[PDB]
Subunit: 170 residues, 3 copies
């Protein structure tokens, strides 16, 4: 007879058998329960880059609420973005963050999450009018996602008061 | 002495003891962590059925974002819905989907979830004005939920640009 | 040789080794999966207290959707709130709830969650105009959170139709 062996996330050390727990995901308070890691509200500025229908950049003030392995993004723009077409792509690369939090892992999506486009709420003012769209993002790599949204009209224009609301599973 | 026996989700095969993991819920990367299953953004059309305060139907364009065991619904209507009263019930039965994704399990709520009404965001235009409500749905069975919302006024009318935003735990 | 010992959330009773599961977080259906606890939609009234930029109180009609260890709050006000400044703090203490649900644990945030400010969506009408803000709350203790939001203008005024939308991890 072979004895008993323990496969991850089960482990054994000095006769004690344990469940190894990601504290951002789970903990025990006797029974197996939700995360024990402290939540963070991160505040930083993110320079987004127009990558299609714009060669412009725009500063976003970002509040990243990290709770368990959910990071929720609340972004607001200062400035006008120059658009050239009826659709624009705005790229969000982790290198274009100033500040940059130490828990950078809270801004990288899981491999599971990265596999699909995800919903992004977009609003902005163009020609004094408030536009609002159900847009979509997709990660191109683990550090970079691009959102795609309508500009409100055609040709060259300036969109202002850009808000972005979305979230990722990390 | 009886020995040791392992209760689900613990299991033993050839001396190796494991935690069986639903990959839509959890995985191990050494420690027990969040889901490893790939996210999906599903796109299909859903014919909703007025079931009270309407005998009409309306085509919805649905984006179902499946991430872990969360499915988030973003629906937008093409067409007018005929209403007859100040409140309407709109039924969403899985059989009235065209396309219909192969991972249909992503559109069935958990028994836990099904036990309560859940929040649904509803908006639409009636008489040129944009209405918006915090509405509620409830599953009648595991395949069928009905949302209940105000129509914006009284008697016969046509509501347009119907949006529905909600999510289910599957 | 010492034998094998089982650390929480693993446990052993009469030779049977188990994973103890918080049913609000997890269950087994063979593999380890999401919560099995029934969801609740709670409905109660909550008297909020102006604690800075107001010495007033305001009745909120609250719908608390409890699903797993997520509680989502949908609040709507009846009445005017008297404000005195350009920013207001509104306190939500569990003692000021009437009704008060028996599953009060669904309205206490986790120690993890409590550690950070969290996003709160606020809207209201002032001077006939509809204001809307991305606001923030923070728990001062496990029973009491305070939201902080702009009033829409300055000096004494009355804000009406106050809505509050937020959620907590419990």
């Amino acid at each position: 007879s072979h004895g008993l062996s323990f496969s991850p996330p089960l482990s054994v050390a000095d006769g004690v058998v344990s469940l190894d727990m990601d504290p951002y995901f789970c903990s025990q308070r006797v029974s197996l329960t939700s995360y024990s890691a402290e939540a963070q509200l991160m505040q930083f500025r993110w320079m987004a880059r127009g990558t299609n229908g714009s060669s412009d950049t725009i500063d976003m003030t970002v509040n990243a609420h990290c709770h368990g392995r959910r990071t929720d993004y609340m972004m607001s723009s200062t400035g006008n973005l120059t658009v050239t077409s009826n659709v624009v792509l705005l790229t969000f690369d982790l290198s274009d963050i100033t500040h940059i939090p130490s828990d950078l892992a809270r801004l990288v999506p899981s491999a599971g999450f990265q596999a699909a486009s995800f919903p992004v709420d977009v609003s902005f003012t163009r020609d004094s009018a408030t536009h609002a769209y159900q847009a979509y993002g997709v990660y191109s790599s683990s550090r970079v996602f691009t959102i795609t949204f309508p500009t409100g009209g055609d040709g060259t224009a300036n969109i202002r008061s850009l808000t972005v609301r979305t979230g990722i599973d990390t």
